[PDB]
Amino acid sequence: SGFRKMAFPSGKVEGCMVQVTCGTTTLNGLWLDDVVYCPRHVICTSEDMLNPNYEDLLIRKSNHNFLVQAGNVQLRVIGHSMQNCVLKLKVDTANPKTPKYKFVRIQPGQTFSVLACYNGSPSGVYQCAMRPNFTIKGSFLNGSCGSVGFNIDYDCVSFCYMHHMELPTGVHAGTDLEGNFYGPFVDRQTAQAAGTDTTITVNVLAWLYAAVINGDRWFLNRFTTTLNDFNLVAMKYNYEPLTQDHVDILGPLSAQTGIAVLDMCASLKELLQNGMNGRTILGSALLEDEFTPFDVVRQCSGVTFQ
Amino acid sequence: SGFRKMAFPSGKVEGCMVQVTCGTTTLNGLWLDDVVYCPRHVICTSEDMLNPNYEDLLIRKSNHNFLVQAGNVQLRVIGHSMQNCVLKLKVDTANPKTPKYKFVRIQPGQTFSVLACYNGSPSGVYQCAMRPNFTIKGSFLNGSCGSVGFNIDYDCVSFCYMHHMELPTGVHAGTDLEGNFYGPFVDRQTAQAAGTDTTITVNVLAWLYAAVINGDRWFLNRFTTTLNDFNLVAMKYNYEPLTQDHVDILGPLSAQTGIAVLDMCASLKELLQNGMNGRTILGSALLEDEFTPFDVVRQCSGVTFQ
Numbered sequence A, B: 001s002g003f004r005k006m007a008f009p010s011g012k013v014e015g016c017m018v019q020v021t022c023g024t025t026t027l028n029g030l031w032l033d034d035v036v037y038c039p040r041h042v043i044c045t046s047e048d049m050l051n052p053n054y055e056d057l058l059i060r061k062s063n064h065n066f067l068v069q070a071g072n073v074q075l076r077v078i079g080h081s082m083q084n085c086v087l088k089l090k091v092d093t094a095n096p097k098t099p100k101y102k103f104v105r106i107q108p109g110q111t112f113s114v115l116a117c118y119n120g121s122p123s124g125v126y127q128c129a130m131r132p133n134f135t136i137k138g139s140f141l142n143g144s145c146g147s148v149g150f151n152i153d154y155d156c157v158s159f160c161y162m163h164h165m166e167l168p169t170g171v172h173a174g175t176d177l178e179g180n181f182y183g184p185f186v187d188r189q190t191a192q193a194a195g196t197d198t199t200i201t202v203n204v205l206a207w208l209y210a211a212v213i214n215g216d217r218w219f220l221n222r223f224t225t226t227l228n229d230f231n232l233v234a235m236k237y238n239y240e241p242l243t244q245d246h247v248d249i250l251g252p253l254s255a256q257t258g259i260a261v262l263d264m265c266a267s268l269k270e271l272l273q274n275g276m277n278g279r280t281i282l283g284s285a286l287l288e289d290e291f292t293p294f295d296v297v298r299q300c301s302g303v304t305f306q
């Protein structure tokens, strides 16, 4: 038992991180087979970064303008192209550590692991959720651009995020690995800002089930509620609506604990209306919404990855 | 910016995990050079686990009683011995993925990364602290014994923990890699229980500095206090004493933020006496004590590891 913010083992991704330099800018790239993926804003100067025409900027670049460092070994760049907001740098060596992989795009409310990197060197791993407003609450400093987010399905790495920028509130924005931004953000210096967020209701319910599995039961009650009446309370507290599909997804956790989904909804309603009155749930005095039902089953049942 | 519970990249440790089977028991081992380390209780039967004499139990074992699985490859065991509460299984192949490593023992209040494993296969990575009562609040299921905790110093893995058991409150106990238990726990089924814990004061102060660095300032005040008068309040709230050495260790964070250590102590006193009044700090409604000053500097300044 116990319940932790748990990331996937990062080894398979560590073997893919490289350093990409163009001009005076250094950031991280992802080396898979003979291609290195990195944010296209690597080619921008400080004054380019204001209002850039990336097609113009890239046509003025040459293969030799891109220095790629794979540990302490040069990679020779033999081609370059732009795909949406990422650059694809063709190199003359296929990464011998290429894992099996997929490029997937995730949904708000889904989670993933982030391998924070600097100068092509991994520094730490942590778990994030894609917020409903398409930002992530990451931990990123200067030089972290090009770090990637991913999930692992058994032996296959599903890359879902590459880091591009920090918004003024300290949250983070980036793209999928096809270079398409999550949310209404652009790789150019505007006054862009996150905009309103909501709490991920189905995840809060999953985490309440995790708590019951780990012996926290004080918030339970004999009460129940209807889905419609629950959603009336959810909207009032900036929670997003609970669908019948969410209820179905919570089925296994409901069966394991013997607590019907709509009963756990009744418990959530009371927590929203009354607060916690000095008590905690799984070491938190807040309702936690960055664990999916899958994350809870993974950790309160025990699947590995090879 | 941002602040996350961040673990070290796990790749170097993933390459060392193997599966160890003896009789009907399967657990994890750590393969370094030509030795595999695992909990000695692997050799116990269910009824052995009650009150065992490990010297007797081990003399009745043979090399061939130990099956070691390195992925999908047999390792032949060519010797076995006991060192305190761990077994050392000599094998006929040195692990080609052995990183540079050290066996270190950590202090209560220090942090480390845990690579949770099952059947020799890594499943997730997360960050823990050694509690003052020598337990860790981990996330571990059946089969997780032999999973290890570690820190990374630059390119060198300092192994500090191997998992042995879950206590009745759901917290976890284990040994250093010399097989010496952290705390007053034994690898045999008694009624042993965690016993009283305290909050790690210097870590709470470090995390308050992290919050200031990330723009949370509402808890600051013009107030100050003396170390002696602070420690009077700390003891009343089950916080452990703050020493002059802790104050010195917080020096860099104090200089970076311009907030004197004893001023931040005054802020902590008020938070302990008044609570937070509906507000949060770095996404928490509790005072967090599992980040060390080093963890804060690492994440709010940005060191990598190669």
Ligand SMILES: *C(=N)[C@@H](NC(=O)[C@@H]1[C@@H]2[C@H](CN1C(=O)[C@@H](NC(=O)C(F)(F)F)C(C)(C)C)C2(C)C)c1cncc2cccc(F)c12
Pocket: A027, A041, A049, A140, A141, A142, A143, A144, A145, A146, A164, A165, A166, A167, A168, A186, A187, A188, A189, A190, A191, A192, B001
């Ligand atoms: C990546 N290493 C770095 N981010 C960028 O280089 C990124 C690119 C231009 C500036 N920028 C960026 O994040 C801006 N933010 C904005 O322009 C925004 F508010 F989002 F609109 C700041 C430098 C002011 C943070 C692009 C294309 C926008 C990066 C990544 N992660 C965290 C960082 C923290 C601090 C400084 C950085 F440069 C950071």
Ligand SMILES: *C(=N)[C@@H](NC(=O)[C@@H]1[C@@H]2[C@H](CN1C(=O)[C@@H](NC(=O)C(F)(F)F)C(C)(C)C)C2(C)C)c1cncc2cccc(F)c12
Pocket: A001, B027, B041, B049, B140, B141, B142, B143, B144, B145, B146, B164, B165, B166, B167, B168, B186, B187, B188, B189, B190, B191, B192
């Ligand atoms: C490791 N895979 C497993 N733990 C053990 O096998 C461990 C060894 C005997 C029983 N045991 C153990 O953790 C007991 N706990 C106790 O005896 C205690 F309360 F600590 F005194 C329980 C099986 C009742 C949990 C030894 C030498 C004590 C293990 C590891 N981590 C989590 C687990 C959760 C559930 C079941 C396990 F077997 C767990």
